[PDB]
Short mmCIF file of C-alpha atoms and ligand atoms in Angstrom, two decimals:
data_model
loop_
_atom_site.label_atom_id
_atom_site.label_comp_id
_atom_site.label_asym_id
_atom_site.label_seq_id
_atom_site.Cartn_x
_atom_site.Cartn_y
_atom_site.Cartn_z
CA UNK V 1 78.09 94.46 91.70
CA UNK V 2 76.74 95.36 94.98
CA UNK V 3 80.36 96.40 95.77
CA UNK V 4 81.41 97.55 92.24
CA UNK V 5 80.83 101.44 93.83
CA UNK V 6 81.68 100.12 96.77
CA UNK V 7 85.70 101.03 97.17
CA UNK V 8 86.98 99.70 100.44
CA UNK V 9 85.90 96.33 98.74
CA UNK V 10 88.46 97.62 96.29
CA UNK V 11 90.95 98.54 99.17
CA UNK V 12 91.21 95.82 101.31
CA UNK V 13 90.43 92.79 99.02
CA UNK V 14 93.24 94.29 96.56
CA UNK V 15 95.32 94.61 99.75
CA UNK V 16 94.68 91.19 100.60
CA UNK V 17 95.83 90.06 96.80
CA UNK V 18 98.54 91.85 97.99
CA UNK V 19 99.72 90.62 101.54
CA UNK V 20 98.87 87.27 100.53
CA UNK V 21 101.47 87.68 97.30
CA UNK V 22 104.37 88.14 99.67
CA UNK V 23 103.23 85.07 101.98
CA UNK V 24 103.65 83.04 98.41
CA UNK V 25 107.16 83.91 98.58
CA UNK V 26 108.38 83.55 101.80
CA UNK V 27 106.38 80.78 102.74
CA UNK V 28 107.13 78.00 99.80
CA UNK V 29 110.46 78.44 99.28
CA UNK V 30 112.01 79.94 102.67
CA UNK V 31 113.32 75.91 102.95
CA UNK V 32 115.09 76.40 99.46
CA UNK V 33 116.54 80.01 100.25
CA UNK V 34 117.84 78.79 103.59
CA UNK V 35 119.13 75.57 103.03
CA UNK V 36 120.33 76.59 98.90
CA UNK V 37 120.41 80.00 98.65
CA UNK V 38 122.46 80.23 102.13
CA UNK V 39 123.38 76.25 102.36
CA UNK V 40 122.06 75.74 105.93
CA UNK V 41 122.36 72.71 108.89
CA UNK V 42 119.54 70.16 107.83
CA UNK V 43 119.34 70.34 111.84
CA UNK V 44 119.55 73.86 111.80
CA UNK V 45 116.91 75.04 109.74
CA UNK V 46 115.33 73.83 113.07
CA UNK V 47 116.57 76.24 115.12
CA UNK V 48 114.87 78.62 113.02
CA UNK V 49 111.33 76.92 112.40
CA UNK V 50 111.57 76.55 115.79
CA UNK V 51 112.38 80.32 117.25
CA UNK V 52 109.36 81.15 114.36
CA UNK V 53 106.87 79.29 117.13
CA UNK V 54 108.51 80.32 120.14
CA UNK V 55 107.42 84.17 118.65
CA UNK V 56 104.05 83.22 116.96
CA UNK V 57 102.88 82.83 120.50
CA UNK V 58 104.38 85.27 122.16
CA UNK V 59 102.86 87.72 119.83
CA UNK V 60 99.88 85.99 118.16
CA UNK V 61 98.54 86.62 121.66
CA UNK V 62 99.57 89.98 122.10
CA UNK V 63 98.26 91.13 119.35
CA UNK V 64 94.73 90.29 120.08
CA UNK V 65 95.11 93.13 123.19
CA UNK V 66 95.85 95.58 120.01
CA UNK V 67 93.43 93.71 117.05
CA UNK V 68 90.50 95.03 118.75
CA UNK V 69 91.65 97.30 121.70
CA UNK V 70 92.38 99.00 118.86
CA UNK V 71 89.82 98.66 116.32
CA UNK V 72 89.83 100.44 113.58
CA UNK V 73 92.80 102.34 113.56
CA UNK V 74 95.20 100.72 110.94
CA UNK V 75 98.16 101.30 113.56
CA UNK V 76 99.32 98.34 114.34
CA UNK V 77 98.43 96.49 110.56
CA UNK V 78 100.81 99.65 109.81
CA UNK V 79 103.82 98.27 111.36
CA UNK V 80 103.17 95.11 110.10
CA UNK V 81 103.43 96.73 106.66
CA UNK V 82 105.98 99.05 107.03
CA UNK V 83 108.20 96.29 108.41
CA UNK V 84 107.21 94.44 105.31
CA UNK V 85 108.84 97.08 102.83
CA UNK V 86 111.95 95.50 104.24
CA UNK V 87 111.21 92.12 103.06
CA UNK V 88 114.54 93.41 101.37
CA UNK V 89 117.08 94.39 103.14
CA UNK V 90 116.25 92.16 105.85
CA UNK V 91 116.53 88.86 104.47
CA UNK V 92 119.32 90.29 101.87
CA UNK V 93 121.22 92.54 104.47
CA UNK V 94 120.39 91.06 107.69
CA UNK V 95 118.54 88.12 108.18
CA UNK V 96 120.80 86.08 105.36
CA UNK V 97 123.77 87.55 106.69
CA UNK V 98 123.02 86.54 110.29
CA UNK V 99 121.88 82.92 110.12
CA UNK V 100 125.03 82.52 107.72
CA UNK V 101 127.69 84.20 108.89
CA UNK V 102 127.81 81.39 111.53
CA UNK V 103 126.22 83.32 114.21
CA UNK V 104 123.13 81.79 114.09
CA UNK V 105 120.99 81.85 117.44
CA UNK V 106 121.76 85.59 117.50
CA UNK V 107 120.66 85.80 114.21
CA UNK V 108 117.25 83.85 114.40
CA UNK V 109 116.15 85.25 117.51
CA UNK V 110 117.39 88.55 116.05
CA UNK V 111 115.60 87.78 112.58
CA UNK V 112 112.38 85.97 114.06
CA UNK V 113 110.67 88.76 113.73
CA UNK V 114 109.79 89.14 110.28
CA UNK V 115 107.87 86.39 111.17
CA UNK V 116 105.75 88.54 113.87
CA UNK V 117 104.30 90.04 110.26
CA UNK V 118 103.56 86.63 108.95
CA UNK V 119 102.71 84.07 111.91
CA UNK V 120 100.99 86.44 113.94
CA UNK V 121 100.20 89.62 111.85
CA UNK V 122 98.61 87.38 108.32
CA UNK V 123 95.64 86.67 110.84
CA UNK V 124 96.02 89.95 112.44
CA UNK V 125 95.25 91.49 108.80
CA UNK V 126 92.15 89.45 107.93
CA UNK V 127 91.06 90.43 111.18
CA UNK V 128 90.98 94.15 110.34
CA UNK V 129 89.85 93.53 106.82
CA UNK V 130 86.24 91.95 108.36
CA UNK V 131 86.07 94.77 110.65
CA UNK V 132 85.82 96.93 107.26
CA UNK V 133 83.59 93.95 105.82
CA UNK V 134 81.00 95.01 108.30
CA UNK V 135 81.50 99.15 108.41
CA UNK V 136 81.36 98.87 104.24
CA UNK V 137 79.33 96.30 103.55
CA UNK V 138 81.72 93.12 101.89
CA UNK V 139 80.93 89.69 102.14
CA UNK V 140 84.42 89.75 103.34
CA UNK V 141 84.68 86.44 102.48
CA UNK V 142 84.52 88.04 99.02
CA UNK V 143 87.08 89.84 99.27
CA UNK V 144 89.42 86.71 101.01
CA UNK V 145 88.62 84.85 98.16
CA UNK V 146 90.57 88.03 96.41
CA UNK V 147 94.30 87.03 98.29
CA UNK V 148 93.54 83.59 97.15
CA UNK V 149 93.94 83.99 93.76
CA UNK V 150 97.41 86.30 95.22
CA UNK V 151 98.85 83.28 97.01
CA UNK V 152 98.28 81.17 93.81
CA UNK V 153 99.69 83.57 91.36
CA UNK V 154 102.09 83.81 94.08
CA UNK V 155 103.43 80.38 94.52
CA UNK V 156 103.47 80.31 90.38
CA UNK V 157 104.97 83.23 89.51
CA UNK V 158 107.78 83.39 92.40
CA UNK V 159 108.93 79.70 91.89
CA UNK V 160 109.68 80.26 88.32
CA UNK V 161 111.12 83.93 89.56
CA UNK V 162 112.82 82.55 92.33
CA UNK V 163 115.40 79.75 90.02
CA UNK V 164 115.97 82.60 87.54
CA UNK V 165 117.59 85.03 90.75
CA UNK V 166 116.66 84.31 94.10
CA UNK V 167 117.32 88.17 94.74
CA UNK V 168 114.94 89.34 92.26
CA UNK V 169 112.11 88.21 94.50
CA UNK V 170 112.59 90.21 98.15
CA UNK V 171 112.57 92.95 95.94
CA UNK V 172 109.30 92.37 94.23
CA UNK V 173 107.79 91.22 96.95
CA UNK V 174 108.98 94.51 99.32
CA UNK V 175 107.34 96.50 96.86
CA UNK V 176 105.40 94.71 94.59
CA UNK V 177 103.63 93.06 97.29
CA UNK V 178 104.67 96.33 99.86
CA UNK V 179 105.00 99.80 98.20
CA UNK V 180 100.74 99.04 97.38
CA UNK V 181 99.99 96.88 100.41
CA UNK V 182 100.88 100.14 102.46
CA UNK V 183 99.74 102.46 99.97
CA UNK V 184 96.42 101.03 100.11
CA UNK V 185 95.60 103.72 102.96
CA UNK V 186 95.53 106.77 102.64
CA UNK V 187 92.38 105.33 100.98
CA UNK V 188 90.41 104.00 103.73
CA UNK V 189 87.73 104.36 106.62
CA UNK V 190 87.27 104.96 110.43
CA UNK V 191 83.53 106.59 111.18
CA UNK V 192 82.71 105.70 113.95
CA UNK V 193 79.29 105.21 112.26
CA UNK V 194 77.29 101.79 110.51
CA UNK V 195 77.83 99.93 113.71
CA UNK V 196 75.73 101.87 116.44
CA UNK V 197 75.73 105.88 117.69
CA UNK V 198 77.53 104.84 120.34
CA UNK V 199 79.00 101.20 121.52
CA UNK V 200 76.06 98.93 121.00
CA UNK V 201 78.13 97.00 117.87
CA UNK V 202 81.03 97.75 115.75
CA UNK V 203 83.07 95.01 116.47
CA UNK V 204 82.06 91.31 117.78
CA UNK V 205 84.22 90.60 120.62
CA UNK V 206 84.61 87.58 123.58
CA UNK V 207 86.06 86.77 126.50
CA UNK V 208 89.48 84.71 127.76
CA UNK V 209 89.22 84.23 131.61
CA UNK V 210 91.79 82.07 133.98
CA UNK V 211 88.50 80.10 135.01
CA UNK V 212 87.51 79.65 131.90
CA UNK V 213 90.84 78.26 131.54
CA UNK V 214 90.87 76.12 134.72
CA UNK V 215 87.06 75.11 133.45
CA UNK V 216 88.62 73.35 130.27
CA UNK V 217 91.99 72.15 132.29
CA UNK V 218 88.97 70.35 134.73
CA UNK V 219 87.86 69.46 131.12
CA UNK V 220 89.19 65.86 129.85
CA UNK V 221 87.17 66.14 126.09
CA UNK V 222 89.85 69.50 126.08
CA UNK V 223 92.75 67.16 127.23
CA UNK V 224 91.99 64.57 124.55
CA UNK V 225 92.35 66.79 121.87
CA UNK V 226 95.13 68.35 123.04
CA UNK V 227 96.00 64.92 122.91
CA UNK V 228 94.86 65.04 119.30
CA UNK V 229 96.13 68.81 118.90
CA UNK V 230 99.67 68.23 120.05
CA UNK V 231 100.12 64.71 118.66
CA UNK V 232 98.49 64.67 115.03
CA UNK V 233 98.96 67.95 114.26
CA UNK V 234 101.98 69.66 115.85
CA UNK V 235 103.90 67.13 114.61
CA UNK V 236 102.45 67.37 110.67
CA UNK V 237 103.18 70.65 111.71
CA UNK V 238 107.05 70.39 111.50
CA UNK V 239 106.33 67.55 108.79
CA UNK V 240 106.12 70.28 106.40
CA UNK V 241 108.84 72.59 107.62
CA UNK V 242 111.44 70.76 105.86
CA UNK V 243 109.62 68.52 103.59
CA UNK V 244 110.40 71.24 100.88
CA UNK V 245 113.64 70.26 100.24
CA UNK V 246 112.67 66.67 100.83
CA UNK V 247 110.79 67.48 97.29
CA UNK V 248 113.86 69.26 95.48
CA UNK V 249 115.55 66.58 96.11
CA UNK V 250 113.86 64.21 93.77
CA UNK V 251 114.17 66.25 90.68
CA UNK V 252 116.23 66.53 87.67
CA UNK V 253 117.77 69.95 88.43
CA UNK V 254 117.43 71.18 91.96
CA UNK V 255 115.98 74.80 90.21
CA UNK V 256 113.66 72.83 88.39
CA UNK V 257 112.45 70.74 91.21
CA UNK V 258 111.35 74.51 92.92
CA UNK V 259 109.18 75.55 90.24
CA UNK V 260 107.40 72.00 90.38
CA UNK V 261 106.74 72.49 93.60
CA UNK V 262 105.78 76.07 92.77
CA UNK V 263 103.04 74.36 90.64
CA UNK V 264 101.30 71.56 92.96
CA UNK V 265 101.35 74.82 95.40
CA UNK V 266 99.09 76.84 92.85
CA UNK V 267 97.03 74.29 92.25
CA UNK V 268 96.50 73.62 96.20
CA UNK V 269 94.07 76.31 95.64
CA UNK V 270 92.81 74.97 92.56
CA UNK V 271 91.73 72.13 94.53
CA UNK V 272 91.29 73.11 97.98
CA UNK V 273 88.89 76.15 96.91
CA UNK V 274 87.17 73.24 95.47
CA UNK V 275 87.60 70.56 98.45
CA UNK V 276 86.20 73.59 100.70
CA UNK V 277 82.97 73.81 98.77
CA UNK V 278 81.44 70.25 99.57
CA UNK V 279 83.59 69.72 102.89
CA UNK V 280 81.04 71.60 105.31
CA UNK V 281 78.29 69.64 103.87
CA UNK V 282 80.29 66.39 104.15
CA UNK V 283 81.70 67.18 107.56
CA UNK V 284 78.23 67.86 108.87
CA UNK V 285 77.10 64.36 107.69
CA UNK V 286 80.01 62.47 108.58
CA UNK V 287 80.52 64.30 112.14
CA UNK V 288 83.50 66.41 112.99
CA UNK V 289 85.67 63.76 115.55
CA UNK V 290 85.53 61.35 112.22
CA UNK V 291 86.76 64.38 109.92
CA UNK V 292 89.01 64.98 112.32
CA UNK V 293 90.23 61.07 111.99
CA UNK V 294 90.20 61.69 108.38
CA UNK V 295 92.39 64.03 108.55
CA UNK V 296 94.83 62.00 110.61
CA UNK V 297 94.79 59.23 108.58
CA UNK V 298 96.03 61.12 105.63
CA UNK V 299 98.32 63.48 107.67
CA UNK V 300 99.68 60.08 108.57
CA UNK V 301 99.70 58.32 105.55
CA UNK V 302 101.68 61.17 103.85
CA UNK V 303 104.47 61.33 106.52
CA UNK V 304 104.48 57.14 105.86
CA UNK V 305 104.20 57.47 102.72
CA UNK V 306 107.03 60.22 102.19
CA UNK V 307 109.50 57.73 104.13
CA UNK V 308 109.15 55.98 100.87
CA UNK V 309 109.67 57.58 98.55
CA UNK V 310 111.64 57.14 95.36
CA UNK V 311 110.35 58.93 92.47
CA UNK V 312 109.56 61.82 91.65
CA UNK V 313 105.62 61.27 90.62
CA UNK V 314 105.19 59.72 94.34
CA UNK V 315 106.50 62.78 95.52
CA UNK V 316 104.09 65.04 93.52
CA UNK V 317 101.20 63.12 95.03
CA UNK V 318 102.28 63.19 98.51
CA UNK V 319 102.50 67.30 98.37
CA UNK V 320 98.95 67.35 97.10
CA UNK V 321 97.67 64.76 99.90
CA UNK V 322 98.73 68.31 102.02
CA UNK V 323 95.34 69.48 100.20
CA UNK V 324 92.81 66.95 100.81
CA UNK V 325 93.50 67.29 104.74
CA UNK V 326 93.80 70.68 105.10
CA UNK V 327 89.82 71.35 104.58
CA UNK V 328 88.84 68.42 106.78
CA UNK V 329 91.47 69.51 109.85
CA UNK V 330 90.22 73.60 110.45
CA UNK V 331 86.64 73.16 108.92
CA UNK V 332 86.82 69.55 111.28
CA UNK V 333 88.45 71.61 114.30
CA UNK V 334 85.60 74.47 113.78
CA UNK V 335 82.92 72.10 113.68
CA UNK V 336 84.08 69.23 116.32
CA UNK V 337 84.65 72.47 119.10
CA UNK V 338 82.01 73.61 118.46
CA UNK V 339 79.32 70.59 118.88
CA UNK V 340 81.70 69.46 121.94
CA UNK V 341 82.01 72.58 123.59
CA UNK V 342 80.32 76.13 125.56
CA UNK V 343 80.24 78.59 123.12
CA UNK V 344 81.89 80.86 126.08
CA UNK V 345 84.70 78.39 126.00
CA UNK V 346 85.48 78.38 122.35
CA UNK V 347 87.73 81.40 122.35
CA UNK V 348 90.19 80.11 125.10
CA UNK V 349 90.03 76.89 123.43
CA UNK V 350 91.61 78.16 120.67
CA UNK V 351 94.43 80.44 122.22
CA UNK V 352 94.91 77.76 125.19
CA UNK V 353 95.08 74.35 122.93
CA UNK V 354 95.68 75.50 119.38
CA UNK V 355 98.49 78.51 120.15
CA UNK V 356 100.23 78.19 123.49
CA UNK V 357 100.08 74.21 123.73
CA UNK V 358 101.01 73.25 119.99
CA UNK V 359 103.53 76.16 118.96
CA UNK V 360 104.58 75.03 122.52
CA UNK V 361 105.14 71.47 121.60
CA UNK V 362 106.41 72.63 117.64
CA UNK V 363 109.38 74.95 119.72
CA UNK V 364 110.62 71.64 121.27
CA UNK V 365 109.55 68.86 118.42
CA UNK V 366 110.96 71.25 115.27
CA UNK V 367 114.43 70.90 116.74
CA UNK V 368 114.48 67.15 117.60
CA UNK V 369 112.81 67.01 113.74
CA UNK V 370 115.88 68.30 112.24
CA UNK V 371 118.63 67.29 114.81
CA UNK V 372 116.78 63.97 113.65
CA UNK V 373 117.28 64.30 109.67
CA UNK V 374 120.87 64.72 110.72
CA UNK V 375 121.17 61.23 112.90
CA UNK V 376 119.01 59.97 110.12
CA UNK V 377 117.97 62.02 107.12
CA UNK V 378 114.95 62.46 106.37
CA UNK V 379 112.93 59.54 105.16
CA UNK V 380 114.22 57.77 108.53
CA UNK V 381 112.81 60.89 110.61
CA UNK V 382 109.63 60.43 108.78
CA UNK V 383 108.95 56.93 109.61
CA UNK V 384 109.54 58.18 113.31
CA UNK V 385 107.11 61.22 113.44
CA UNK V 386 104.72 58.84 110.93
CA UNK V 387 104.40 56.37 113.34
CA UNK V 388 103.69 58.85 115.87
CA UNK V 389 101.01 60.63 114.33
CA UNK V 390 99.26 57.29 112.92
CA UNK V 391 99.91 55.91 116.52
CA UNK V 392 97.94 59.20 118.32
CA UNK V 393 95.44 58.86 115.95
CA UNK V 394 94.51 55.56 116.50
CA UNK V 395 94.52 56.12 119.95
CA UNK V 396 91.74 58.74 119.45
CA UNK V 397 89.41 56.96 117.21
CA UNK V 398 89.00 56.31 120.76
CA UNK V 399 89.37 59.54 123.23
CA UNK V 400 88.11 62.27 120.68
CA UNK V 401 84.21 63.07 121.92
CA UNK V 402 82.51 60.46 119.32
CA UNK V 403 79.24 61.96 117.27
CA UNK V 404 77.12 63.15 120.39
CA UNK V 405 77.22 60.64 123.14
CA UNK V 406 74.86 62.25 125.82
CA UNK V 407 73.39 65.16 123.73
CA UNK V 408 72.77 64.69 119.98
CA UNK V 409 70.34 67.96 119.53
CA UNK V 410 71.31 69.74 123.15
CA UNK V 411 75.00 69.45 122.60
CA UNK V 412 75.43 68.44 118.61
CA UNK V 413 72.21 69.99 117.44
CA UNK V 414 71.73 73.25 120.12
CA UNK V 415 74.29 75.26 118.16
CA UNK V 416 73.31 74.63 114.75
CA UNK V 417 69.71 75.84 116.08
HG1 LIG T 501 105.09 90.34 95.91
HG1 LIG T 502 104.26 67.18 118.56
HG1 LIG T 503 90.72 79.50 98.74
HG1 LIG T 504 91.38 74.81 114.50
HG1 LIG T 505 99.76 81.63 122.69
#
């Protein structure tokens, strides 16, 4: 409508139905292709899940230096693409290859890297893609909610692809989901113009200082929800890594138990989009820190729950608890920082607890996860990591800052007005 003339609307939400097409394939099912398409060490597969966080933070980090130091010059989003027309090749010719033929620290470390255009590069996009949102006029959040429908369509389509030829997949999505999200350029905008003459705007930007830093470490409210952060979380984190396989496993054929999964994927959307619509409004009556509790006590319950399992139905119910949270946990996170903390701060917060302390305690955890479903399987390992993620979160229904002790309008209410 007010964009239908409007064509970098065009560009960049198509090229985020696009980006977000390929994350529907290699995100799903990279447990399947590893551990069936190349038959890899239940322990092993954490070696792997666990260089992908060592990177993720060395680059995620990084790449914030070049996501604005470099504004809007698609440079760096143009490695990320080009190195994504090799979807192909690399997992095919390289990355398969590696991991398998048995040389497989040299071959994660060497293949963890793919994952710099995924962990650290998928937010590194929809950075970029706002920065047009403003110059051109999208609600960019109309155009996000454009590589939603991708990532849907994606999980669907690919699952149901993926059983018929695993193959047949790096080679859509190197193409189908590269060849266009890299053409989508030579179509696209710079002017320095629609922001101010000179520097005034352009580009919102903040500040990450050591003090800042050693403000939060003198900070306990930080510490207890990096207690929260690195307990909870972290450790739902690598809950999911392998769970996918955890899912397979309960199905009638194993390339039948994909596409299933495929499905309560592509309808995570389906019911998240929806979920996301009241959440705000809920979280801002029931108060973050209790959202955030919410969150845990499903988190938890579905790691519990998973470690006993025996159907197949169970199973489908526990992959679509993974929805419910979801909202609750970022939209809590957003809101609970927020009403607990200086505005300043917030930035740091983020990098310092939620990237260099979790993918921190996710390189270390993801390896005892799967050197545990060895010792034990799975099931076992989840009563382990269920126990202590329900445990942490009891323990903050006490430590987490509760709804506005000492400032209900000054430090709950200030922000919001
Ligand atoms: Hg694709
Ligand atoms: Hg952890
Ligand atoms: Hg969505
Ligand atoms: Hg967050
Ligand atoms: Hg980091």
């Amino acid at each position: 409508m007010y964009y239908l003339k409007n064509t970098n609307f065009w560009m960049f939400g198509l090229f985020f139905f696009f980006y977000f097409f390929i994350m529907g394939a290699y995100f799903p099912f990279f447990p399947i292709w590893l551990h069936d398409i190349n038959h890899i060490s239940k322990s092993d597969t954490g070696i792997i899940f666990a260089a992908i966080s060592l990177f993720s933070l060395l680059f995620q980090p990084l790449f914030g230096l070049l996501s604005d130091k470099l504004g809007l010059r698609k440079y760096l989003l143009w490695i990320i693409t080009g190195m994504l027309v090799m979807f192909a090749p690399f997992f095919i010719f390289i990355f398969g290859p590696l991991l398998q033929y048995n040389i497989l620290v040299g071959s994660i470390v060497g293949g963890i890297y793919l994952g710099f255009c995924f962990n650290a590069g998928a937010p590194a996009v929809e950075a970029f893609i706002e920065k047009v949102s403003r110059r051109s006029n999208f609600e960019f959040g109309r155009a996000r909610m454009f590589g939603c429908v991708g990532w849907a369509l994606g999980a669907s389509i690919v699952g149901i692809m993926f059983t018929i030829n695993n193959q047949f997949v790096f080679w859509l999505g190197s193409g189908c989901a590269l060849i266009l999200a890299v053409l989508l350029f030579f179509a696209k905008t710079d002017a320095p113009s629609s922001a101010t003459v000179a520097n005034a705007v352009g580009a919102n930007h903040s500040a990450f200082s050591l003090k800042l830093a050693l403000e939060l470490f003198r900070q306990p409210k930080l510490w207890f929800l990096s207690l929260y952060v690195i307990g909870v979380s972290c450790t739902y984190d690598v809950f999911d890594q392998q769970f996918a396989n955890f899912f397979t496993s309960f199905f009638a054929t194993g390339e039948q138990g994909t596409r299933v999964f495929g499905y309560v994927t592509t309808m995570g959307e389906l019911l998240n989009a929806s979920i996301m619509f009241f959440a705000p409004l809920i979280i801002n009556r029931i108060g973050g820190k209790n959202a955030l509790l919410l969150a845990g006590t499903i988190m938890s319950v579905r790691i519990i729950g998973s470690s006993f399992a025996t159907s197949a139905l169970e199973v489908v119910i526990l992959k679509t608890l993974h929805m419910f949270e979801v909202p609750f946990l970022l939209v809590g996170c957003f809101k609970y920082i927020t009403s607990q903390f200086e505005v300043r701060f917030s930035a740091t917060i983020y990098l310092v607890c939620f990237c260099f302390f979790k993918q921190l305690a996710m390189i270390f955890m993801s390896v005892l996860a799967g050197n545990m479903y060895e010792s034990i399987g799975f099931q076992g390992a989840y009563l382990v990591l269920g126990l202590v993620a329900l445990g942490f979160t009891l323990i903050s229904v006490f430590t987490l800052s509760g709804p506005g002790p000492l400032s209900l309008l000054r430090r709950q209410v200030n922000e919001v007005a």
